[PDB]
Design a protein around this ligand. Structure first.
Ligand SMILES: [Mn+2]
Ligand SMILES: [Mn+2]
Ligand SMILES: [Mn+2]
Ligand SMILES: [Mn+2]
Ligand SMILES: [O-]
Ligand SMILES: [O-]
Lengths: 483, 481
């Protein structure tokens, strides 16, 4: 069958991937006792947009549920799936013949049918007539709450939909649950996004020089990903934090736009991940700007390496994700004490939630078509109201097919350190004579993407991770070199 | 005073640029007989957005009118200007101290006052209180129709605005008219965007190899512009059309995403322009993929080079832009006749609008903070309902300080050719046996950015243009042009 492909060394993605997703969704809905015979799933794709009131077009990137089901790259479409038969119909815009003046060949409906390997293609303005003739019982539309943004998913609507019975509650938890569990075909794409983003991270580590602006490395990363990987988009805005900016967790946005000059002795924390055909990657590499870890940098870095590897070694089906977050906290506290930054009982430190001073964010999150992927908090799974844990994007138990980031870090964040020093319950654990040395250190984060297997994990990411590996990479060693 | 800068070799842009724009706006409003004493201009900045229902952030780019007036890069702001005094107040979000963890330093109001060189800074949650204390007659807000998109400008709103008298008709035509005329400080930025984008086009011409994907050159272009120019955004989505795609005017978008392999013998038409601090550039270069023009390619290319230069040379204050569009049409028809694609009287061809078969788009447009900049069709300036001319984005007469693209092209577009061949009034001019050779040729566009001066134009773009320059550039020969 047909494949999406951007040529050269880029990945061929079979359109069968999306057919399988549609099949799996139907299979799930068929098992759902509340789904009526003759129901049809109705999804509305994204539409073209412009900047504010201008005619400056914004590059169109498909809505994630619609992409998951159909893989369609064009704006202005709808898509329906008959639950009982699995039959798929794509609705595409009707462009007047005169648009050929501007657009070139206007593609036929047969073109799209062949391209996307759907059962039928119709024009969008005919959706009411086509659905009327199929005599559906119920239209199942998409409405629900994203638990990371708090936004409500956009439910499909078309002129005449009021003539139909519409249910907008059943679909969302079901299609979310399908997205949580990745197919073999989806895993091939996520291996690829990790391959290209890993290569790009290595190129960035090889190219970094003291004196460069952070954004020069953002640019280089995105150029590698697009020119060598066919990744027109990033999965999220690149975070290129140097020096103290490596302690700024959302760094790189318009208000702090990767515009610092990298200095000798800085740590760099670069969190970047290309997107291929709407599939994410999310990788963070931490390393010394000048290519040589100081003793203090080695100690902080290796503490995060220890927690990274301990969590990866413990992950398997049945593990409760919050227990992994707490494992990373404990290890960080142990290692910060072995460094002289902290003193006292680590058991007592954990009871005081001291780990959250150094890692205020969650250990990791589902990843898929969105970088913060759907389904972390389905009904009945509760957020934990404790420092650090409250920032976790899922409190689920791990199961085969889930894809997660594993991203412990340690940061030296003044207002959190100062709060701790002001708090009699935490202040005694902090040794200021050593801690003072780490004010302005920034932070270290080591972020891997992994798949939960039947018995453990598969690591998707492939970047240098030991101090020796990183120093070798920055010294321009071939990848096929083993410190 | 302070300046915007991304370090290295990037341009320092004085915040005084925006202060001058505010002054100029007030001066126009003060002359407007409908403007009441004690009016306050109220603009609302852009807000942070995410992809659909996700928490995936979209990189924030400021709304163009707000940028023009204030130069502010942060989301969630408002800005007001007292018309009678010119006093400026920026309203910034009040962030809880707890935010220092994620988005970085919680800058004070004083930090922003110094950064933007405004007269006062307040928090957004205080805007109604602050404006109430100023006892305005009326709030002047932004509402109007963009004549390229057809969209209505988003008028400012805030909690409590209903307690004020608001006028949403006066401002838009006045701030649009200010934007049409670029200040010397604005021109320095547009010289820079054209410098960097010109350099990036040159690197692309040096790098193109048969067998590459179109998007490889888009990537290189944007990488040059960001890493060397500090241009995080492009002014519009890059058009990297090769072969028959160079005849596709709307190419490079999501539905046709620069995904063709460049083949030996193809023409390339690359329309790309970096954006710096929300100021545009818009440049198109056309050239053979393999670095050597064939005779047919040379003939089509030099025809557009001739119209490009004829239009630039004729532009001066008082020239009617539609006349420049028809000048290019006439030159194209002359050259296509010399080539043998056409036969007969060029006067009769013009009368039959045959030029629009080969150039269906407008000759060029205003450029500024938006690539298709505002103010092409103010009240009293009408669109001309003829082929080609109806696509013009302005029918104004030129005046010093206007910035325009000059972008004639010749394309071989099957829909338009077939229509012409069915029409006895146009078919007689077309030599089918010669035209057949050019089916699938693609197209050529040469796009320069220029400023109207007191006596002529200033050319901002600096890329290789003659056949000799282009071939030398692509062969990897040393030096400029
Ligand atoms: Mn990340
Ligand atoms: Mn992450
Ligand atoms: Mn252009
Ligand atoms: Mn243009
Ligand atoms: O992350
Ligand atoms: O253009």
């Amino acid at each position: 069958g047909p494949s999406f492909w951007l040529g050269n060394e880029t990945l061929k993605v079979p359109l069968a991937l999306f057919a399988l997703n549609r099949q799996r969704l139907c299979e799930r809905l068929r098992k759902n006792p509340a789904v009526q015979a003759g129901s049809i799933v109705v999804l509305q794709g994204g539409e073209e947009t412009q900047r504010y009131c201008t005619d400056t077009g914004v590059l169109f990137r498909q809505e994630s549920f619609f992409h998951w089901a159909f893989g369609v790259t064009e704006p202005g479409c709808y898509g329906v799936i008959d639950v009982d038969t699995g039959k798929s119909t794509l609705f595409v815009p009707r462009l007047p013949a005169s648009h050929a003046t501007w657009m070139g060949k206007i593609h036929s409906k047969e073109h799209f049918k062949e391209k996307y390997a759907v059962d039928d293609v119709q024009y969008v303005d005919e959706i009411a007539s086509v659905l009327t003739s199929q005599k559906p019982s119920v239209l199942l539309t998409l409405r629900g709450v994203n638990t990371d943004s708090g936004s409500v998913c956009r439910e499909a609507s078309f002129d005449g939909i009021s003539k139909f019975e519409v249910n907008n509650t059943i679909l969302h938890p079901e299609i979310v649950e399908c997205r949580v569990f990745k197919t073999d075909m989806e895993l091939e794409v996520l291996r690829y996004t990790n391959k290209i983003s890993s290569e790009a991270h290595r190129e960035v580590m090889k190219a970094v020089k003291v004196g460069m602006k952070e954004y020069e490395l953002e640019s280089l990363f995105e150029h590698y990903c697009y020119s060598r990987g066919g990744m027109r988009h990033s999965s999220y805005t690149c975070i290129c934090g140097s020096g103290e900016n490596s302690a700024v967790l959302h760094y790189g946005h318009a208000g702090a736009p990767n515009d610092r000059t990298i200095q000798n002795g800085d740590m760099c924390l670069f969190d970047m991940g290309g997107e291929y055909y709407c599939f994410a990657s999310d990788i963070t590499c931490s390393f010394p700007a000048n290519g040589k870890f100081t003793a203090d940098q080695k100690a902080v870095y290796e503490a995060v390496l220890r927690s990274s590897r301990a969590v990866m070694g413990a992950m398997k089906p049945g593990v409760w994700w919050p227990d992994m977050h707490r494992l990373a906290d404990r290890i960080h506290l142990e290692e910060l004490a072995h460094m002289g930054i902290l003193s006292g009982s680590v058991d007592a430190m954990v009871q005081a939630h001291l780990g959250a001073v150094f890692m205020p964010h969650g250990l990791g999150h589902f990843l898929g078509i969105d970088v913060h992927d759907v389904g972390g908090y389905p009904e009945g799974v509760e957020r934990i109201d404790e420092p650090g844990l409250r920032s976790l994007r899922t409190a689920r138990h791990l199961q085969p097919g889930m894809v997660l980031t594993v991203e412990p870090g340690i940061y030296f964040i003044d207002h959190l350190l100062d709060e701790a020093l002001a708090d009699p319950a935490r202040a005694s654990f902090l040794n200021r004579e050593v801690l003072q040395r780490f004010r302005g250190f920034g932070g270290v984060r080591i972020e891997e993407d992994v798949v939960v297997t039947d018995s453990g994990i598969e690591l998707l990411t492939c970047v240098p991770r030991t101090v020796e590996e990183i120093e070798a990479c920055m010294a321009g060693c071939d990848k096929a070199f083993t410190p």
